[PDB]
């Protein structure tokens, strides 16, 4: 999948997590978020397809995405110990991260 | 998982997508298809375990699988924007791709 | 996700597989197990963060995890051909593998 496809997956997974009841759906959706973030890290946003791969404007993208993956792993571990709500709360903060980053590169 | 395990996953995921109603199940199953295709790309079909890794007969396999992954990403982006049916239709064309390729290397 | 997050995912996925009825939920959960095992292979258990990457005590971890991934692929192929119960039985043996390995590095 390409970059905005994966960011779209992240947004909708967030809608899945928010409306979920048990630990397993939250954890599953969080793992889908993990996969999709990983790929969009390997991908390149459309507005950025014409800047240097060693450009700071692109390398910034690389580390913001590193950040996203980190936060997702944290939330996954909270959903892992079974704290389904503290993990849903981490997902709130996560949607903050995801929205900032999608907005910066949506174009 | 090995190659035919992943092609089997693809076929059954297709059966999941066809009988699905909402956008999220289609998108989830499509992501499972993404993962499984990726791995079977890294794997090697049984009938092909004895041809050169630089063989055209094997390198053909490599690019047909590249094709499959590409089509899956497209269908994922249609299921991402919420076009659950146009994505189900892309999944139809996808089952064409998947069946051709499984048939070529099933043995 | 980090190492114990992925081992926790494996344990709970096992609880999903045991209480499942159809082939598709077993296969899906097994694929989540595949992903999570892969990552925890790339990760490093907390008690092991201070031994050589070429240490036998760490390289042992690397191959025990190789073993786990192998068994998961086998079980996935049984769940692929639709043998939902023989795959549930492989999942029994799998929980043996997973528990041994989580116990060895839990700390």
Number of folded domains that form chain C: 1
Query: Which residue in the set A2, A32, A35 is minimally distant from B77, CB to CB?
Result: A2
Crossing angle of helices A56-80 and C3-18, rounded to 10°: 50
Q: Encoding tokens for residue A23?
A: 């630990």
**Contact check, Cβ <8 Å, C81/B8:** yes
Give CA–CA dist C6/B101, Å, rounded: 33
**Contact list, C77 vs chain B (CB under 8 Å):** 1-2, 4-5, 8
**Contact list, C70 vs chain B (CB under 8 Å):** none
User: How far apart are the CA of B1 and the nearest CA of chain C, in angstroms?
Assistant: 4
- Show the CA angle centred on residue B17, arms to residues B103 and B5, nearest 5°: 40
| Best CA proximity match to B12, nearest among C30, A96, C39, C61 | C30
Crossing angle of helices C56-80 and B3-18, rounded to 10°: 50
Give the resolution value in Å: 2.3
From residue A68, alpha-carbon distances to B38, B101, C92, C98 in Å are 23, 36, 35, 28
Structural domain containing residue B34: 1-107
Residue B29: closest C-alpha in chain C = C28
**Contact check, Cβ <8 Å, C2/A73:** yes
Q: Encoding tokens for residue B68?
A: 């499959």
**Contact check, Cβ <8 Å, A23/C32:** no
| Best CA proximity match to B26, nearest among B89, B71, B84 | B84
To which residue do tokens 């991260």 refer? A97
From residue A37, alpha-carbon distances to A106, C39, C74 in Å are 15, 14, 28
- Whether A72 and A33 have beta carbons less than 8 Å apart is answered as yes
| Best CA proximity match to A27, nearest among C16, C45, C42 | C16
What percentage of chain B's residues is helix, strand, coil (to nearest 5)?
80, 0, 20
In this structure, how many other beta carbons lie within 10 angstroms of the beta carbon of residue A39? 19
Alpha helices for chain C (secondary structure H)? 3-18, 23-42, 56-80, 84-105
From residue A71, alpha-carbon distances to A92, B47, B92 in Å are 11, 43, 36
Give CA–CA dist A76/C22, Å, rounded: 26
């Amino acid at each position: 999948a390409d970059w905005e496809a994966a960011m779209l997956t992240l947004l909708m997974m967030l809608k899945v997590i928010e409306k979920a009841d048990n630990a397993a759906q939250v954890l599953t959706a969080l793992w889908f978020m993990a996969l999709a973030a990983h790929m969009a890290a390997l991908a390149t946003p459309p507005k950025l397809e014409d800047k240097s791969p060693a450009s700071p404007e692109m390398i910034d993208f690389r580390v913001g995405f590193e950040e996203l993956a980190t936060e997702i792993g944290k939330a996954i571990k909270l959903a892992a110990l079974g704290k389904v709500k503290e993990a849903q709360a981490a997902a709130e903060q996560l949607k903050t991260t995801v929205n900032a980053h999608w907005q910066k590169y949506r174009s």
